[PDB]
Amino acid sequence: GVFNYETETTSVIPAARLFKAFILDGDNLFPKVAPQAISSVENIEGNGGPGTIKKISFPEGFPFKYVKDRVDEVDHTNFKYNYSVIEGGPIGDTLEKISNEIKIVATPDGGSILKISNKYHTKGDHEVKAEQVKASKEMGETLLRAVESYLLAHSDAYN
Numbered sequence: 001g002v003f004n005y006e007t008e009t010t011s012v013i014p015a016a017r018l019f020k021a022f023i024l025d026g027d028n029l030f031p032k033v034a035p036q037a038i039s040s041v042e043n044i045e046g047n048g049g050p051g052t053i054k055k056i057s058f059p060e061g062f063p064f065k066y067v068k069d070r071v072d073e074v075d076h077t078n079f080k081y082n083y084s085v086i087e088g089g090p091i092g093d094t095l096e097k098i099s100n101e102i103k104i105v106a107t108p109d110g111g112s113i114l115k116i117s118n119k120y121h122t123k124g125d126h127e128v129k130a131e132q133v134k135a136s137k138e139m140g141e142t143l144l145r146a147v148e149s150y151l152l153a154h155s156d157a158y159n
């Protein structure tokens with residue numbers, strides 16, 4: 001079945017710029033700005049649109065070695081990005097995939113709000129735990145804050 005988890009978080013970076021950096025250029029930025037969270041990002045196949053597969057490797061000592069993510073949809077107009085965790089890490093005989101949707105909306109103060117859904121597609125009679133979802137949220141927030149710091153410090157990047 002499907003377990004749905006949702007969260008909202010804020011950023012001080014404007015929506016379009018955050019989308020360009022944090023979403024569209026995560027392959028470059030995450031290992032650069034958060035090497036203690038993400039060791040590398042490998043493009044396995046595809047040119048960045050729907051169907052693109054990336055292998056995200058974690059540092060030594062982390063719970064999982066890697067995950068392979070698949071880009072599902074990229075909406076450059078509405079700052080929407082959908083992708084799925086499709087192999088590695090928690091994926092296996094209890095979990096088929098994790099389907100994620102991110103939408104970034106502008107705020108009047110010149111920042112943004114990120115609205116995130118994660119849908120866990122399980123196999124058989126297994127349940128998703130608070131701690132698994134929490135670990136994913138912590139990671140997402142860590143990457144967000146690292147990218148945000150970089151973008152504050154590098155004003156000519158991603159305009």
Ligand SMILES: O=S(=O)(O)c1cccc2cccc(Nc3ccccc3)c12
Pocket residue numbers: 005006007009100102114116117118133134136137138139140141144
């Ligand atoms: O989806 S993620 O791509 O890891 C993600 C991406 C970007 C920012 C995120 C911020 C908070 C939580 C996330 N994950 C999350 C995990 C569980 C429930 C709700 C959100 C974030």
Ligand SMILES: c1coc(CNc2ncnc3nc[nH]c23)c1
Pocket residue numbers: 022023026027041054056069070071082083084102140143
């Ligand atoms: C939320 C947290 O990180 C992202 C960037 N999305 C993303 N990053 C790196 N590889 C991906 N492959 C599919 N989606 C990917 C969105």
